[PDB]
């Protein structure tokens, strides 16, 4: 996250950290995700696309730091990994960038509720907040597009939703953005999501609930003027989610 503040998981108790193990000893961070229900985490397909070997990923819930433990964290293995059929990547966007990870503990259980682990709510069929709404994104991605490491402490920032009309202007992303995507940016292009933030949530309040309105998917650069962050529009994937959960 460029800008933003550092936080603890208490503040985003549904954020999931996904890592990959290597035959060598190291585990590296891949992407973020969100807990939907006790056994399911939702993220983005582009995060798994190149190495869809579920057995090598580890999911941690209740984690405030990246490579050091937090008291209360839970570790899970990926029992099922569901990527989207119709996922496509072009010279910028990712289409149908949503994925589901069913988690299993080494003891055979799914997540347990704590002060650091909670589920986020899903929206109702094609129901989104209006452009202008301030939503928050959270993650462990880069703080500067030029960095080559990720922060050790979790970060969060608030961004506002912008309309499709604004985002599809030729000097923004043109028709690279579709109705199944959403764009969010800071009015003064100061904060934004970036590499390493993929998969994590864009949360907004809808009808009184903190709802997962988007999943970090792509953007041109990070915090670039007229280059909003694009997210997968969850409200449009509800049928797909349902058929699997």
């Amino acid at each position: 996250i460029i800008g933003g503040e550092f936080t603890t998981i208490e503040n985003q108790p549904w954020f999931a950290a996904i890592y990959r193990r290597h035959r060598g000893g190291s585990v590296t961070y891949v992407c973020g995700g969100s807990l939907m229900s006790p056994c399911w985490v939702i993220s983005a397909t582009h995060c798994f696309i190149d190495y869809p070997k579920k057995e090598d990923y580890i999911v941690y819930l209740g984690r405030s730091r990246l490579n050091s433990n937090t008291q209360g964290e839970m570790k899970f293995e990926v029992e099922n990994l569901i990527l989207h059929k119709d996922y496509s990547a072009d010279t910028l966007a990712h289409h149908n960038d949503i994925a589901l990870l069913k988690i299993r503990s080494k003891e055979g259980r799914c997540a347990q509720p704590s002060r650091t682990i909670q589920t986020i709510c899903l929206p109702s069929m094609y129901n989104d907040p209006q452009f202008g709404t301030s939503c928050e994104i959270t993650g462990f991605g880069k703080e500067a597009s030029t960095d080559y490491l990720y922060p050790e402490q979790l970060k969060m920032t608030v961004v506002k939703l912008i309309s499709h009309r604004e985002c599809q202007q030729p000097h923004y992303y043109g028709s690279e953005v579709t109705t199944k995507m959403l764009c969010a940016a800071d009015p003064q292009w100061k904060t934004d999501a970036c590499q390493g933030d993929s998969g994590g949530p864009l949360v907004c309040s809808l009808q009184g609930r903190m709802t997962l309105t988007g999943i970090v998917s792509w953007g041109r650069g990070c915090a670039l003027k007229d280059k909003p962050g694009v997210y997968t529009r969850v409200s449009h994937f509800l049928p797909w989610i349902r058929s699997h959960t």
Partner: peptide, 8 residues
């Protein structure tokens, strides 16, 4: 106690 989605 039990999950209550969106509750911090």
């Amino acid at each position: 106690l039990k999950f209550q989605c969106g509750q911090k």
